[PDB]
């Protein structure tokens, strides 16, 4: 009994953004469904709603270029937006409301889907992966923090694991950032004993059908 | 509209924090008002609906009240797990602009202060041939929030910097941070000393490297 937003990705200003709220284990029919979004560093913003009994209602900013449609045969609610701009780059969420009597008691939320609006010259771009290791330090240590810098990819996301997922203790993978180029980057680090075997970051970028493994070792010294 | 004050608040562990929400007009039946909790990287979570009713699984130290157009969320016995942005949502009608989200109140939970341990990572050898280099600085397990400054041969950098912060630890309230400085390859090869300075008010932790030594 959950909802999930369909795949987001990279969109051109002339594209149509189509996002589907799909349900598993319950029905969207006869229940309110809301579409909201969150731009980086901004608060939640309402887009529009499908009422439990068939009315569709919108935020006034969205109404002129958005359509929200219910499909009670496929058990979905879809958001379609046109005239895309950089302001539409955001995480998009849908949610289902169990009880009409709460009006806004939206209790079943999707995980969110990542959307980036590029300029015209935006094509997907695979990440570059560079090892992170400290400089040669005069007092070597019994433990060391190594990592991988994942640089210059488009759109989100990448997923990072260490040693094919078997290494999780001491791993910290930071939220992505978006550099001045418009490309995304993130860092992942792991603390290990200086005696243990080399560690490998596995960086997958589905949008370019790319996976990159970098085996990281302490610098020669 | 729903007007939320303050936009941010810090509260010590164990204390009580209040979040305010003023509706620009009455909500429907004066009670169509919900509160949500959202932690970075997660979807919103319903806390309270119909002004004061707790959602399933939500503990009663979360309390909602309302009177006229004023609504208040009170969180007592605050724990680090309460760090989040809190939103009120009001509803008047199923029409254009018929519901509204508040702007949110970020609640920072104050644990014990602790200075970061800071790591700096010189660019891997294969970066510079690409025409740009990215230096990484990591600040581990710190509280309160930091500000990051980068220096190159003693000159403070004003562009090319991005910061990424993990959310407050649900156990001890601490943060972790990754800061990056990106320079052109000729800038990087023209300078020697690279410095990341992580500051918490009157405390700073500084980590450097010299390009010729790595």
């Amino acid at each position: 009994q959950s909802v999930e937003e369909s795949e987001g990705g990279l969109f051109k200003p002339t594209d149509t953004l189509t996002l589907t709220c799909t349900a598993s284990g319950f029905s969207l029919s006869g229940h309110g469904v809301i579409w909201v979004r969150q731009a980086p560093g901004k608060g939640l913003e309402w887009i529009g709603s499908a009422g439990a009994y068939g009315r569709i209602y919108y935020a006034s900013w969205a109404k002129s270029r958005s359509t929200i449609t219910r499909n009670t045969n496929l058990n979905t609610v879809t958001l379609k937006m046109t005239s895309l701009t950089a302001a539409d780059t955001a995480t998009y969420f849908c949610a289902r409301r169990s009880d009409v009597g709460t009006s806004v008691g939206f209790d079943s939320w999707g995980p969110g889907t990542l959307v980036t609006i590029s300029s015209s010259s935006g094509q997907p771009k695979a990440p570059s992966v560079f090892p992170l290791a400290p400089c040669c330090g005069d007092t070597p240590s019994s433990t060391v923090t190594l990592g991988c810098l994942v640089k210059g990819y488009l759109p989100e996301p990448v997923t990072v694991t260490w040693n094919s997922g078997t290494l999780t203790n001491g791993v910290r993978t930071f939220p992505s950032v978006r550099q001045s180029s418009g490309l995304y980057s993130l860092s992942s680090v792991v603390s290990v004993t200086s005696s243990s075997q080399p560690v490998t970051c596995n960086v997958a970028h589905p949008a370019t059908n790319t996976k990159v493994d970098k085996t990281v070792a302490p610098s020669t010294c | 509209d729903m007007t939320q004050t303050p936009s941010s608040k810090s509260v010590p562990v164990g204390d009580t924090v209040t979040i305010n929400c003023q509706a620009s007009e009455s909500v429907y039946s004066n009670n169509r008002l919900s509160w949500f909790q959202q932690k970075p990287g997660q979807p919103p979570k319903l806390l309270i609906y119909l002004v004061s009713t707790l959602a399933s699984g939500v503990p009663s130290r979360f309390k909602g009240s309302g009177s006229g157009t004023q609504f208040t969320l009170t969180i007592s016995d605050v724990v680090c797990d309460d760090a989040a942005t809190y939103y009120c949502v009001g509803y008047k009608s199923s029409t254009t602009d018929g519901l509204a989200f508040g702007g949110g109140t970020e609640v920072v939970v104050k644990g014990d202060p602790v200075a970061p341990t800071v790591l700096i990572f010189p660019p891997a050898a294969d970066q510079v041939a690409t025409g740009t280099v990215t230096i990484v600085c990591v600040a581990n397990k710190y509280f309160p929030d930091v500000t990051v400054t980068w220096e190159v041969d003693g000159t403070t950098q004003t562009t090319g910097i991005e910061n990424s912060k993990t959310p407050q630890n649900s156990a001890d309230c601490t943060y972790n941070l990754s800061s990056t400085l990106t320079l052109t390859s000729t800038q990087y090869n023209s300078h020697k000393e690279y410095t990341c300075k992580v500051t918490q008010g009157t405390t700073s932790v500084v980590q450097s490297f010299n390009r010729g030594d790595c």
């Binding site: 009422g51 068939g54 | 429907y28 029409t95």
Partner: peptide, 5 residues
């Protein structure tokens, strides 16, 4: 106006 009612 009020969810269908």
């Amino acid at each position: 106006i009020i969810x269908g009612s």
